[PDB]
Amino acid sequence: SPPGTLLPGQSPDEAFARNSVVFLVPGAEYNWKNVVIRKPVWIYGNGATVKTSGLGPIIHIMGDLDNPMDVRIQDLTFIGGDSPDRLVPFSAVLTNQMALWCIDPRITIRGCSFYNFGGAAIYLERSERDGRGQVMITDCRFRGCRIGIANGGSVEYGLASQNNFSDCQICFNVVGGNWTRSGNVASNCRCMYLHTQGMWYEGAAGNFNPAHGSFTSNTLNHCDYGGNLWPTEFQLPDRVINLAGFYFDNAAARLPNFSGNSQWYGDMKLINFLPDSTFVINGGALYGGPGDTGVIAVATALAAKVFVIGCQGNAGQQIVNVPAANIIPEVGTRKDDATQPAA
Amino acid sequence: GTLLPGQSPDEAFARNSVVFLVPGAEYNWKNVVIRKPVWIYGNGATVKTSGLGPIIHIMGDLDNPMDVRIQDLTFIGGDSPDRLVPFSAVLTNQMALWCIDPRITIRGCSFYNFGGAAIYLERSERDGQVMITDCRFRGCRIGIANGGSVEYGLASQNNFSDCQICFNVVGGNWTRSGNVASNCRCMYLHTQGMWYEGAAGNFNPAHGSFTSNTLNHCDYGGNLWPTEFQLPDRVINLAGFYFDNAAARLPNFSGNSQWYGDMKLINFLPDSTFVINGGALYGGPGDTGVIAVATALAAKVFVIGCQGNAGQQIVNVPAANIIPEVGTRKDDATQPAA
Amino acid sequence: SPPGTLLPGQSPDEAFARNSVVFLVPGAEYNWKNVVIRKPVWIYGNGATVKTSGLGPIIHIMGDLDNPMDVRIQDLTFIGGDSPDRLVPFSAVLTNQMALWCIDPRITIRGCSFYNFGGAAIYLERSERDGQVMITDCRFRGCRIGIANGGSVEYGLASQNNFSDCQICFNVVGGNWTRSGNVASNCRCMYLHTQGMWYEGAAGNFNPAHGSFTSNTLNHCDYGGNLWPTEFQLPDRVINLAGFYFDNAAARLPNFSGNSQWYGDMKLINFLPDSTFVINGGALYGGPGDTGVIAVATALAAKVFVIGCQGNAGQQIVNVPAANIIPEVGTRKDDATQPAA
Ligand code: MMC
Ligand code: MMC
Ligand code: MMC
Ligand code: MMC
Ligand code: MMC
Ligand code: MMC
Ligand code: MMC
Ligand code: MMC
Ligand code: MMC
Ligand code: MMC
Ligand SMILES: [Cl-]
Ligand SMILES: [Cl-]
Ligand SMILES: [Cl-]
Ligand SMILES: [Cl-]
Ligand SMILES: [Cl-]
Ligand SMILES: [Cl-]
Ligand SMILES: [Cl-]
Ligand SMILES: [Cl-]
Ligand SMILES: [Cl-]
Ligand SMILES: [Cl-]
Ligand SMILES: [Cl-]
Ligand SMILES: [Cl-]
Ligand SMILES: [Cl-]
Ligand SMILES: [Cl-]
């Protein structure tokens, strides 16, 4: 192997430690487990596939926020197992079933695919509370994963755009604040966006300065009806929750900006958020029914702070607890029901 | 993995999972067939062709997890186009890529002077992720044609210029975001009885997402393609955005710029509303960049959070449906014409 | 040296003039100054780094708008110096401290990084008034200006880029660009357009701005992170920068939708009267004090709308009439001393 090439069966750790850039064998099958990257390196995957066994992650990446060079991973497929067991309860042990675990990340992940991870396919965390460590995840595919992307507290200002999710329970497990998530396509996932207190994958910085990012031009279809196979019921560290397409429950956090999103048979649960704010579902397409499929529900206590502006939709779409004066133009069927949203 | 000019592409694709072209070289291909996933690193090469297209036929395997991927490759379909020739079934073959049952990624490629659709995607049967990003389309009759049941694709950050129709839309649920189009007659077309519906037909159509796009100089100040356009069974008069299908819903439409970029909302499924949200609507003088809705459906259309000038005409949408006021509101039941 | 490879220490000018596509040595360190590209060429940077010295640009690119092939630069890091001197007054001298100076560009810049440029990291100009431009997935850090597009450099796309610790991200003259999905933090100004700018180029301040500005984030511009000064020297006067600064009676504002402004002040000083402007679908968070103020000139206030925006009580909206703000967001205020140029 000339310098820069990493063959199947060779030691990845040694290759990464000795090279600033590494090229994999085009279309080859690798088998990696707990590989450790301690310095910036670029990996050109060249259409290769990385399988694994046992307890993940496939790669541990120890970031150096001081170093101007980023870790970059392009054009690589990661396989976490065979098609998932969706009925297994989630637990601390399964949080290890990751493709990438990055701490203090300065990373670019572009054109990669992630199949059948029992935890988060990608997990980013910060070793200490503070965003000069820029994170970019674009043009990736996620299929069969429990969680797509988990960003811990103080992993901030990342960009996750133009990704495609299908058959995942939770696409974005959101803790760290200020991310832009734009132009992502999701279908047959229980939940595109989850934020609450007491989450998995908060990391060492904890649930700090959370969410309040940007969520634009995304599609979240068939969350609760007409495609998704993952259960609604989901085990957090201290309690069970009932997932929705968009789930937000944290009295100490603000919601992201929410504009240009399509929700066909979604459901959205705005359970709790910081009272010194408003929230607008802006420029959305809201399609649902018949029955309670693709419901948007807000806590009555906060309903007056929620608006639905410039949205299109059908009569079958239910909007729950938002005052009629707050919905311009009329869209869907407006309803009052203080039992909704349930946590 | 290297494929040289003059070698057989079919053999190279059938024998390799990944193929690298000679950087900057000129290839000459015609009716190449790909039957298994393969990645092509184009490396700035150019592919010319002759006769009847496509340049490449791609027979997809939806069962197979690997995608076909094509990067950094320029496709040339001919010399600068004959814009006055009537469109016909024969010209539908003048394609760069024809993909069936696609699981495909097309990134950083350029498509010049195709007499049909530069890219055509179809499904062999009614119900495979599709990504088309950072591509350039210039001089093509049609940019991207997605047939019925080719759904949930992403076409973003592409640039279209001097094309008659950028997106020939049949298949549903695509995201089309951040595309820049100038001097094209039509950015988006959906109707019944289209070209390139493919085997699944006009099924579960449109109702996708159309955000942050720019469609400029469609009917004035740049475009050279004719308005009049031949579908299989009738002639239509194109607009920057043309929608006529009583059995389909419109996409979400937010953050788009329309400078001299006419829109015709002729017909759509009555159990829906439509909003032109967060747009910039600039037009006039005269009837340039008109937004027109059928009077029968006008009450279901809203123009919300849009900016624009006095010269921009908005036709048949009720005044109560336009917040804030933008342009010059007008009633005219002869608009929009098919 | 096989065809298409350019090694450190070899002449870049000769390599570019002899090849249509060039591959750099993966992860190698190059040192270039005033390299000249006269014909389309693609550069695969392969994670290499380019340092420089003296007066920039690192690369001069003389475009041929007649030629269908683009210049393409991928996966390359450009270093303009050590961490910047933010208190130095800006002057004509420093405008040369660029990574890329392109004239009559047909160019794609993808996956590149730009560190510590004393001028514009990227400057695009047109040699004559009336060529597709794409700048995506790039990082800009410590630069005075990120991207400067001169007059008649139009219809470019700048999307999915990340800016931090820059004074001005986009120095906007040329019209009709789409700027979408960009993330900026700790920069004094994300968008600047006015008369009498730096980097107007040979075509001047012609057919300016009026593009598209969507899904961007501009955070901590005037508070809580940014270290660059507000006060900024243009050729003929000093201005006081804001996160979004627009002052040109002869130009229209871009479409403005889906943007987040946390401590991200906006000054709409002057713009063409035959238009309206809408802050659509935004998140507007500010306070306490005058941090993240949105201010419009009282003369033009009636033409400005704030539609479908969310925010907090601390966010100040100045001079926009109450009837123009739907739904209510922030604290509405009248003050004709704002915005100051
Ligand atoms: C971070 Hg292992
Ligand atoms: C970190 Hg602003
Ligand atoms: C995808 Hg919900
Ligand atoms: C089928 Hg939406
Ligand atoms: C599908 Hg050829
Ligand atoms: C391009 Hg209309
Ligand atoms: C030129 Hg708008
Ligand atoms: C173009 Hg120097
Ligand atoms: C970044 Hg203001
Ligand atoms: C702190 Hg935003
Ligand atoms: Cl660790
Ligand atoms: Cl679905
Ligand atoms: Cl967020
Ligand atoms: Cl191979
Ligand atoms: Cl065929
Ligand atoms: Cl034009
Ligand atoms: Cl659509
Ligand atoms: Cl009004
Ligand atoms: Cl070469
Ligand atoms: Cl020059
Ligand atoms: Cl976008
Ligand atoms: Cl602009
Ligand atoms: Cl938007
Ligand atoms: Cl004034």
Give the closest-approach CA distance of A230 to chain B in angstroms: 20
| Other beta carbons within 10 Å of B283 | 26
| Residue found under tokens 């036929």 | B57
Report the residue from C77, C258, C307 with minimal CB separation from A260.
C258
Phi-psi region of A265 (alpha: psi -120 to 50; beta: other; left: phi over 0): left
> Hey, which residues 175-234 in chain A have their CB within 8 Å of chain B?
182-183, 185, 187, 216-217, 219, 221
* Chain B residues near residue C42 by CB distance under 8 angstroms: 23-24, 44
SS3 A20: coil
Single-letter code of the amino acid located at A173: N
How many residues are present in chain C? 341
| Residue found under tokens 């350039």 | B136
Calpha distance C183→C167 (Å, rounded): 14
Q: C238-240 and C231-233 as β-strands: parallel, antiparallel, unpaired? A: antiparallel
Cβ of residue A257 closer than 8 Å to a chain B Cβ: no
SS3 B198: coil
Ligand 9 atom nearest the C-alpha of C187 is: 1
Ligand 9 atom nearest the C-alpha of C163 is: 1
Encode C255-267: b = buried (16+ Cβ within 10 Å), e = exposed. bbbbbbbbbbbbb
- Ligand 19 centroid, distance to B23 Cα (angstroms): 5
Nearest 10 degrees: CA dihedral of C10, C12, C15, C17?
Answer: -150
Residue partners of A162: CB distance under 8 A and separation at least 6: A138, A139, A182, A183, A184, B131, B133, B154, B156, B157, C160
Q: B117-122 and B142-146 as β-strands: parallel, antiparallel, unpaired? A: parallel
DSSP codes of every residue in B50-96: -SS--SEEEE--TT-SSPEEEES-EEE-SSSP-TTSPP-GGGGG--S
* CA-to-CA separations, A160 to A148, B24, C117, C181, C309, in angstroms, rounded: 11, 32, 27, 10, 23
- The helix or strand, by DSSP H or E, that contains position A35, with its residue range, turns out to be strand A35-37
What tokens were used for C68? 């269908």
* N-terminal to C-terminal alpha carbon distance within chain B: 51
- The helix or strand, by DSSP H or E, that contains position A249, with its residue range, turns out to be strand A246-249
Calpha distance B144→B189 (Å, rounded): 11
Are B255 and C215 an interchain contact pair (Cβ–Cβ within 8 Å)?
yes
Cβ of residue A5 closer than 8 Å to a chain C Cβ: no
Ligand nearest to the CA of B259: 7
Report the residue from B17, B154, B254 with minimal CB separation from A47.
B17
- Ligand 3 centroid, distance to A208 Cα (angstroms): 26
**Closest to A58 (Cα-Cα) out of A134, A126, A113:** A113
Interface test with chain B among A49, A138, A185, by most B beta carbons within 10 Å: A185
Is-cis flag, bond preceding C235, omega within 30? no
> Hey, which residues 12-51 in chain A have their CB within 8 Å of chain B?
26-27, 46-47
Helices (H), chain B: 9-15
* Chain A residues near residue B255 by CB distance under 8 angstroms: 217, 259-260, 283
**Closest to C111 (Cα-Cα) out of C137, C134, C135, C133:** C137
Give the residue, by CA position, lying nearest to ligand 9 atom 1.
C185
Nearest 10 degrees: CA dihedral of A147, A153, A157, A158?
Answer: -30
Interface test with chain B among A79, A83, A262, by most B beta carbons within 10 Å: A262
* Chain A residues near residue C181 by CB distance under 8 angstroms: 159, 161, 180, 182-183, 216
Size of interface B-C (CB pairs under 8 A): 140
CA nearest to A160 within chain C: C160
Residue partners of C100: CB distance under 8 A and separation at least 6: C57, C58, C59, C61, C73, C78, C109, C121, C122, C123
* Chain B residues near residue C307 by CB distance under 8 angstroms: 278, 304-305, 323-324
Give the closest-approach CA distance of B44 to chain C in angstroms: 7
Calpha distance A98→A103 (Å, rounded): 13
Give the experimental resolution in Å: 2.3
> Hey, which residues 164-183 in chain A have their CB within 8 Å of chain C?
178, 180, 182-183
SS (H, E, C) C99-151: CEEEECCCEEEECCEEECCCCEEEEEECCCCCCCEEEECCEEECCCEEEEECC
* CA-to-CA separations, B250 to B269, B335, C249, in angstroms, rounded: 8, 19, 37
CA C329 to chain centre: 28
| Other beta carbons within 10 Å of C226 | 25
| Other beta carbons within 10 Å of B32 | 18
**Closest to A139 (Cα-Cα) out of C137, B98, B254:** C137
Read off the DSSP letter of residue B316. Answer: S
CA A119 to chain centre: 12
| CB C127 less than 6 A from any atom of ligand 8 | no
* Chain A residues near residue C139 by CB distance under 8 angstroms: 70, 134
CA nearest to B155 within chain A: A162
DSSP codes of every residue in A51-98: E--SS--SEEEE--TT-SSPEEEES-EEE-SSS--TTSPP-GGGGG--
**Closest to B181 (Cα-Cα) out of B222, B152, B235, B234:** B222
Give the closest-approach CA distance of A285 to chain C in angstroms: 14
Are A278 and C329 an interchain contact pair (Cβ–Cβ within 8 Å)?
yes
Calpha distance A321→C226 (Å, rounded): 40
**Closest to B115 (Cα-Cα) out of B144, B84, B97, B142:** B142
Calpha distance A312→A331 (Å, rounded): 6
**Among positive and negative, which fits the CA dihedral B7, B13, B14, B15?**
positive
Q: How many domains in chain A?
A: 1
| CB A102 less than 6 A from any atom of ligand 1 | yes
**Closest to A269 (Cα-Cα) out of A303, A287, A245:** A245
Phi-psi region of B62 (alpha: psi -120 to 50; beta: other; left: phi over 0): alpha
What tokens were used for A305? 């702070």
Calpha distance B207→C132 (Å, rounded): 30
Calpha distance C232→C217 (Å, rounded): 22
Residue partners of C319: CB distance under 8 A and separation at least 6: C295, C296, C297, C298, C301, C333, C334, C335, C336, C338
Backbone phi and psi for residue A83, each to the nearest 5 degrees, phi listed first: -50, 145
| Residue found under tokens 């006529």 | B244
Are C110 and B134 an interchain contact pair (Cβ–Cβ within 8 Å)?
yes
What tokens were used for A107? 């990373």
| CB A220 less than 6 A from any atom of ligand 3 | yes
Q: A246-249 and A219-221 as β-strands: parallel, antiparallel, unpaired? A: unpaired
* N-terminal to C-terminal alpha carbon distance within chain C: 56
What tokens were used for A330? 């009329």
Q: Is there a contact between C326 and B323 (Cβ–Cβ < 8 Å)?
A: yes
Q: Is there a contact between C191 and C166 (Cβ–Cβ < 8 Å)?
A: no
Measured at the CA of B112, the angle between CA B217 and CA B259, to 5 degrees, comes to: 10
**Among positive and negative, which fits the CA dihedral C14, C18, C19, C23?**
negative
Calpha distance B144→B160 (Å, rounded): 10
| Other beta carbons within 10 Å of C284 | 27
What tokens were used for C339? 């915005």
- Ligand 4 centroid, distance to B119 Cα (angstroms): 23
Residue partners of B110: CB distance under 8 A and separation at least 6: B73, B74, B75, B135, B136, B137, B138
Read off the DSSP letter of residue C65. Answer: T
Calpha distance C180→A68 (Å, rounded): 25
Calpha distance C151→A102 (Å, rounded): 43
| Residue found under tokens 């993909």 | B99
Q: How many Cα atoms are found within 13 Å in the side-chain-facing hemisphere of A114?
A: 35
Q: Is there a contact between B177 and A185 (Cβ–Cβ < 8 Å)?
A: no
Instruction: Tell me which chains share at least 3 CB pairs under 8 Å with chain A.
Output: B, C
Full domain range(s) for residue A94: 1-343
Calpha distance A118→A97 (Å, rounded): 5
Report the residue from C20, C181, C253 with minimal CB separation from B44.
C20
Size of interface A-C (CB pairs under 8 A): 148
* Chain A residues near residue C26 by CB distance under 8 angstroms: 4, 20-21, 23, 42
Calpha distance B200→A4 (Å, rounded): 47
Single-letter code of the amino acid located at C172: V
User: Experimental technique used?
Assistant: X-ray
Measured at the CA of B206, the angle between CA B204 and CA B211, to 5 degrees, comes to: 150
Q: How many Cα atoms are found within 13 Å in the side-chain-facing hemisphere of B238?
A: 29
Report the residue from A4, A159, A255 with minimal CB separation from C160.
A159
Phi-psi region of B152 (alpha: psi -120 to 50; beta: other; left: phi over 0): left
**Closest to B133 (Cα-Cα) out of A151, A185, A99:** A185
Calpha distance C91→C234 (Å, rounded): 8
What is the Cα gyration radius of chain C? 20
Q: Is there a contact between C34 and C50 (Cβ–Cβ < 8 Å)?
A: no
Q: Is there a contact between A35 and A41 (Cβ–Cβ < 8 Å)?
A: no
- The helix or strand, by DSSP H or E, that contains position C24, with its residue range, turns out to be strand C21-24
